[PDB]
């Protein structure tokens, strides 16, 4: 049941911004590992004496990597005379974030009809303001409110119908057209110490509604058309094995973004391409489930995948779960950096064809049961 109670006009996920120590090395690693193209830059070569920012794109997916230069380069500037292309940037905020959290997501950005309006209604509805609406070259408006921890939900709106003003397109020579099938951001998942207040706060200022489905507790906030999806986890203390949400909070120094789910238009090509590169600069994957798991998928999704595609799931380590309206293919990378905090999920959804409706197949809630049952039958 979808009340469609959005308090302002939300369109889609627009980009994800990583705050880094060195944007160059993180970005080049991510480009190779994920098959994303360098598509825009704002840095010393574009006149930006404040921060270095490099944009990777794959389909509609936009990963932005930003790091601070020495404040001495911009010591003479003031906010009216700034050369930063992203006016919310702050040297001290950025260095604090990185030293506290390590490599991680600073902004979950959604496009909206009117960023100034979305900021005002949000703050009027309990949102903690982070950066006030600022209009960039009379073309784009951007505004920020706190989401959880030091993560901000960023509103961006365009008068027109090129990422942001001040960013230049990167030269063809430095833009090799990598592509492993990733097409768009499906959802972004946060970890917090307690679920209730985080939900009450975010649902409070957005009007996002709870999305139904079927060592943690979780719930998913969703926009009107359920294309902006924001699950949130809290830890369940007392279990035999220590909750990984708790281990997240410990290594991240509190709440933050836990993982990003990237939709692929062909999850088999994506996993083949990423797994080719795991040990030559790309990303590692979580240990595959036992073949037990895969023997039992026939009874579950033999309706939906052939024996060959089930066998191909076993090669790549893919997981499969299923709602009452669709089926979900998913796999999880290992942590993206030094700490056991942020990781990436690759997914592909099958079913619920209207285009495809959001969250088709759910988010993998069934795979807790099927993992313990598969590990218990592989031991036998």
Ligand X SMILES: N[C@@H](Cc1ccccc1)C(=O)O
Beta bridge partners of 185: 262
Number of Cα atoms under 13 Å in the Cβ half of residue 288: 16
Binding-site member from 48, 233, 270, 327 for ligand X (CB under 6 A): 233
Least distance between a second copy and beta carbon 336 (Å): 8
Q: Locate 135 and state its tokens.
A: 């209009």
Told to check if 359 binds ligand X by CB under 6 A, we report: no
Q: Is 259 annotated as a binding residue?
A: yes
Task: Tell me the C-alpha distance between 74 and 50, whole Å.
Answer: 6
Least distance between ligand X and beta carbon 368 (Å): 9
Q: Locate 181 and state its tokens.
A: 């099938």
Told to check if 363 binds Co ion by CB under 5 A, we report: yes
Binding mask 185-224 for a second copy (x = CB under 8 A): ----------------------------------------
Q: Is 187 annotated as a binding residue?
A: yes
Tally of helices (H runs) and strands (E runs) in the chain: 9, 17
Strand arrangement of the beta sheet that strand 326-332 belongs to = 209-210, 216-222, 229-235, 182-191, 256-264, 343-351, 326-332, 319-322
Q: Is 355 exposed, middle or buried (0-12, 13-18, 19+ CB in 10 A)?
A: exposed
Whole-number Cα distances in Å, 283 to 55, 263, 303, 336: 19, 16, 32, 7
Told to check if 288 binds ligand X by CB under 6 A, we report: no
Told to check if 211 binds Co ion by CB under 5 A, we report: no
Task: Tell me the C-alpha distance between 238 and 116, whole Å.
Answer: 44
Choose among Co ion, ligand X, a second copy, none what residue 175 binds, the Cβ cut-off being 5 to 8 Å by kind. a second copy
Least distance between a second copy and beta carbon 27 (Å): 9
Residues 317-346 that bind Co ion (CB under 5 A): 345
Choose among a second copy, ligand X, Co ion, none what residue 233 binds, the Cβ cut-off being 5 to 8 Å by kind. ligand X
Told to check if 174 binds a second copy by CB under 8 A, we report: yes
Q: Is 345 annotated as a binding residue?
A: yes
159 CB-near residues (< 8 Å, 6+ apart): 138, 139, 140
User: Given the complex with ligand X, which of 337 and 340 has the nearer CB atom?
Assistant: 340
Told to check if 2 binds a second copy by CB under 8 A, we report: no
3 CB-near residues (< 8 Å, 6+ apart): 209
Residues 155-214 that bind ligand X (CB under 6 A): 189
Binding-site member from 9, 11, 12, 28 for a second copy (CB under 8 A): 28
Binding-site member from 116, 168, 225, 284 for a second copy (CB under 8 A): 284
Q: How many CB atoms lie within 10 A of CB 302?
A: 11
Binding-site member from 102, 256, 362, 364 for a second copy (CB under 8 A): 102
Told to check if 231 binds ligand X by CB under 6 A, we report: yes
Whole-number Cα distances in Å, 12 to 115, 154, 155, 204, 336: 13, 12, 11, 19, 24
Are 31 and 56 in contact, with CB atoms under 8 Å apart?
Answer: yes
Binding-site member from 274, 333, 363, 366 for ligand X (CB under 6 A): 363
Q: Specify the pairing of strand 182-191 against strand 229-235.
A: parallel
Q: What is the DSSP letter of 165?
A: T
Binding-site member from 39, 83, 175, 288 for a second copy (CB under 8 A): 175
Binding-site member from 9, 12, 21, 215 for a second copy (CB under 8 A): 21
User: Given the complex with Co ion, which of 115 and 350 has the nearer CB atom?
Assistant: 350
Contact positions toward a second copy, by CB under 8 A? 20-26, 28-33, 38, 43-44, 52, 67-70, 72-73, 95, 98-100, 102-103, 173-176, 178, 250-251, 253, 279-282, 284, 336-340
Contact positions toward ligand X, by CB under 6 A? 189, 218, 231, 233, 363
Binding-site annotation: residue ranges for Fe cation: 187, 259, 345
């Amino acid at each position: 049941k979808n009340p469609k109670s959005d308090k302002f006009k939300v369109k889609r996920f627009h980009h994800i911004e990583f705050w880094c120590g060195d944007a160059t090395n993180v970005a080049r690693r991510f480009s190779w590992g994920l098959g994303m193209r360098f598509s825009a830059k704002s840095d010393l070569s574009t006149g930006n004496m404040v921060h270095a920012s490099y944009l990777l794109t794959s389909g509609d997916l936009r990963f932005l990597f930003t790091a601070p230069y020495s404040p001495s380069l911009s010591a003479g500037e003031i906010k009216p005379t700034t050369t930063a292309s992203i006016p919310s940037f702050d040297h001290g905020s950025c260095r604090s974030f990185f030293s506290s959290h390590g490599l991680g997501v600073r902004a979950v950005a959604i496009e909206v009809e009117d960023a100034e309006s979305a900021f005002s209604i949000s703050v009027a509805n309990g949102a903690i303001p982070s950066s006030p609406p600022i209009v960039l070259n009379e073309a784009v408006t951007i505004a920020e409110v706190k989401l959880y921890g030091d993560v901000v939900l960023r509103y961006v709106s365009y008068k027109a119908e090129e990422f942001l003003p001040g960013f230049e397109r990167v030269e063809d020579a430095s833009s090799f057209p990598l592509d492993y099938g990733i097409r768009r951001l499906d959802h972004a998942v946060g970890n917090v110490p307690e679920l209730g207040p985080a939900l009450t706060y975010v649902a409070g200022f957005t009007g996002f509604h709870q999305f139904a489905e079927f060592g943690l507790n979780s719930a998913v906030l969703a926009s009107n058309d359920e294309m902006v999806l924001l699950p949130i986890n809290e830890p369940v203390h007392g279990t035999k094995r220590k909750s990984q949400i708790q281990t997240y909070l410990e290594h991240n120094e509190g709440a933050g973004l836990q993982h990003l789910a990237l939709m692929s238009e062909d999850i088999f090509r994506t996993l083949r391409e990423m797994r080719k590169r795991s040990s030559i600069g790309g990303f590692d994957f979580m240990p595959s489930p036992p073949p037990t798991y895969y023997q039992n998928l026939k009874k579950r999704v033999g309706d939906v995948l052939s024996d060959d595609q089930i066998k191909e799931c076993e090669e790549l380590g893919i997981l499969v779960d299923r709602d009452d309206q669709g089926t979900l293919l998913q796999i999880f990378t290992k942590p993206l950096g030094d700490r056991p905090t942020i990781f990436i999920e690759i997914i592909q959804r099958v079913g619920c064809m209207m285009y495809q409706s959001g969250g088709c197949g759910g988010f993998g809630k069934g795979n807790f049961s099927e993992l313990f049952k598969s590990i218990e039958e592989y031991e036998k």
